[PDB]
Write a protein that binds this ligand. Structure first.
Ligand code: HEM
Length: 405
């Protein structure tokens, strides 16, 4: 379904890209989004899909817009407009300077310091999880590791019982890839209902878990309110439940289809870190945007106040103008340029946790299960949305080849 073209949007700039259901989705989700960068597509286009909105197709514009919060506000970061308007997570929907305070408190619960004191657990969990699968000679990756691994760590992080994983997970998925059952608002409201009671209890006594830290936090002056606490916790759900999870499946799907790259890491461990960044560029997966604060001519195009513009974080690193032969995975890429963890004042606060989980996965997995491949005769399917992901990943291997360390 297409929205009628607003009077102010050029005739020649219309490219009906459906961010939640791209035409070339069959060739991989990153490949589907890459069409927006073909020789005949303007740097900045307008799509009549999902309420109609702009779409910067080049990392140059993307990076640029993400730096100018004065014009491109995070107030309404999601598409459709109903989703963005409803989006009120702190600080992801705030613009500087208001953001500073909250982002600083949020940084306390997932930043590097937290990731370092968690390294051992993260590592132990990966091993424990993999050692379990190893003798099976097969697995449904997305659900057997890609999900349990990041989520349990996040739940331990937040101090939330693991029983709530399916619940919190489903709702979170509705904010990134709506199955259609519920709107963004409803999903958000549902998550808030889960958090609020928890915040109330934790607000009392201190606490090492994320929710406590936030609930007992102090932003610009007075103590943090429950609503603020709520909005802050929310901003952590997508990352702790839906981003890493999907990223691992993309990266692992690739590794299963490319023995070469696997062998390379297996016999050249030291390259795992660099390999992680390249996979982060290649299989980048987030794409949100901003809303115009006023009428503004941006690169020849006249944007009106209230317009929404999609700045796919996943496109920068695929832009041939920033990375030669972008669709090729080269662990030895001299300059791995990308905006996978975003760009600007909203740079991902969990990228450290992300990278560690990715590095621990590649390390522990390849060591114990170096030789594996996609189950015989199976097609891997992707899904596109605020956060694209992999539907399922059937992997198989011979147990005799596995190892225990
Ligand atoms: C590999 C996985 C991940 C990717 C690709 C990713 C990507 C991003 C991107 C592109 C943004 C910018 C959003 C915007 O500007 O509107 C962002 C923000 C954010 N991410 Fe992540 N992220 C990942 C994992 C995580 C994890 C595991 C967490 C922690 C639970 C997390 C927490 C956050 C937070 C709190 C923000 C908001 C920062 C702010 O508004 O100041 N992310 N992420």
């Amino acid at each position: 379904n297409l929205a009628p073209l607003p009077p102010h949007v050029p005739e020649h700039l219309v490219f009906d890209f459906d961010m939640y259901n791209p035409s070339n989705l069959s060739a991989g989700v990153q490949e589907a989004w890459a069409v927006l960068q073909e020789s005949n597509v303007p740097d900045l286009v307008w799509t009549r899909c999902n309420g109609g909105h702009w779409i910067a197709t080049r990392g140059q514009l993307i990076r640029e817009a993400y730096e100018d919060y004065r014009h491109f506000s995070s107030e309404c970061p999601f598409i459709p407009r109903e989703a963005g308007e409803a989006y009120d997570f702190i600080p992801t929907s705030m613009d500087p300077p208001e953001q500073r305070q909250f982002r600083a408190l949020a940084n306390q619960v997932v930043g590097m310091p937290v990731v370092d004191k968690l390294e051992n657990r993260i590592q132990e969990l990966a091993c424990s999880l993999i050692e379990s699968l190893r003798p099976q000679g097969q697995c449904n990756f997305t659900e057997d590791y890609a999900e349990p691994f990041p989520i349990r760590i996040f739940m331990l992080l937040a101090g939330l019982p693991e029983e709530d994983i399916p619940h919190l997970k489903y709702l979170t998925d509705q904010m990134t890839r709506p199955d259609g059952s519920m709107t963004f608002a409803e999903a958000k409201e549902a998550l808030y209902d889960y958090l609020i009671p928890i915040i109330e209890q934790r607000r009392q006594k201190p606490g090492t878990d994320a929710i406590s830290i936030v609930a007992n936090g102090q932003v610009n002056g007075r103590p943090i309110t429950s609503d603020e606490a709520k909005r802050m916790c929310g901003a952590l759900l997508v990352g702790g439940l839906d981003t890493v999870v999907n990223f691992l499946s993309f990266s692992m799907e690739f590794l299963a289809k490319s023995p070469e790259h696997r062998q390379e890491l297996i016999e050249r461990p030291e390259r795992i870190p660099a390999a992680c960044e390249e996979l982060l560029r290649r299989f980048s997966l987030v794409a949100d945007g901003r809303i115009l604060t006023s009428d503004y001519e941006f690169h020849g195009v006249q944007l009106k106040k209230g317009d929404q513009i999609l700045l796919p974080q996943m496109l920068s690193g695929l832009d041939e103008r920033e990375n030669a032969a972008p669709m090729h995975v080269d662990f030895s890429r001299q300059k791995v340029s990308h905006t996978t963890f975003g760009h600007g004042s909203h740079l991902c606060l969990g990228q450290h946790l992300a990278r560690r989980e990715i590095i621990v996965t590649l390390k522990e997995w390849l060591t114990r299960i170096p030789d594996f491949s996609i189950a015989p005769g199976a097609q891997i399917q992707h899904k596109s949305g605020i956060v694209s992901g992999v539907q399922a990943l059937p992997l198989v291997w011979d147990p005799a080849t596995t190892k225990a360390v």
